[PDB]
Amino acid sequence: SRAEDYEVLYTIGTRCQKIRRKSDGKILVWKELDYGSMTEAEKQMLVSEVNLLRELKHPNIVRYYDRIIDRTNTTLYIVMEYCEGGDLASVITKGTKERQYLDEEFVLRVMTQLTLALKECHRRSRDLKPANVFLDGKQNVKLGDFFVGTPYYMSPEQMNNEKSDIWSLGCLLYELCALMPPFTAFSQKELAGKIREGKFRRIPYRYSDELNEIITRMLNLKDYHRPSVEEILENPLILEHHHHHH
Ligand SMILES: COc1cc(-c2nc(-c3cc(OC)c(OC)c(OC)c3)cnc2N)ccc1C(=O)O
Ligand SMILES: [Cl-]
Ligand SMILES: [Cl-]
Ligand SMILES: [Cl-]
Ligand SMILES: [Cl-]
Secondary structure (H helix, E strand, O other), X not given: OOHHHEEEEEEEEOOEEEEEEOOOOOEEEEEEEXXXXXXXXXXXXXXXXXXHHOOOOOOOXXXXXXXXXXXXXXXXXXXXXXXXXXXHHHHHHHHHHOOOOOOHHHHHHHHHHHHHHHHHHHHOOOOOOHHHEEEOOOOOEEEOOOOOOOOOOOXXXXXXXXXXXXXXXXXXXXXXXXXXXXXXXXXXXHHHHHHHHOOXXXXXXXXXXXXXXXXXXXXXOOHHHOOOHHHHHOOOOOXXXXXXXX
């Protein structure tokens, strides 16, 4: 459980790094947290949060393996699973650039696997946005945990609840299909206006009426009209092959 046990291969983002465990060569990543400027109170909060990450064990949640303290650089390293497919944000950006919509099959995989991730989070009782959803090398979808930005996915009620998570999932799935979020605007007040009206374009026609129907239900203005996790998973669209596979 020391940094020396691992070799940094290179930096993914800014710090998050792809690393290799020396003992068996296993590829992982770690996230660097400089706690050198924190108070004792903040470090305590950090410790409890990290111990709670360690408890989450689910195929559709990014696996956290270890925590490493290097008192020399006052740096904490959270070691986690490597997701070779990167994040959903990049996938959506790629789709726009190459002017190519994503397969309905892929959207169904994300819907299925993220719904299961949410079901697990709710049972244990993480913002649902494309940058916080990762793809491994086997078509599996994993939920991670990362002012200026526009709050595209904020639910009507949250702007005034497990059904709020369903709204957010709805926005994410809509954006995967349309390559844009269901409500866009240049200011938050304008955005809020659009959200309260609850109107949006149908996802593109290449997608089935069945898929459009469920995403639209998730975007209902009334939280109680949005489908539950259980009701989503009962949908005839969702099949075994859309779930995770080792
Ligand atoms: C659990 O949350 C995190 C996951 C990761 C993480 N990121 C990547 C990753 C891989 C890429 O290409 C191979 C990327 O480029 C598109 C990429 O862009 C953001 C990310 C792979 N595996 C991972 N486990 C990183 C950080 C976090 C976090 O919560 O801070
Ligand atoms: Cl397009
Ligand atoms: Cl398709
Ligand atoms: Cl359209
Ligand atoms: Cl898996």
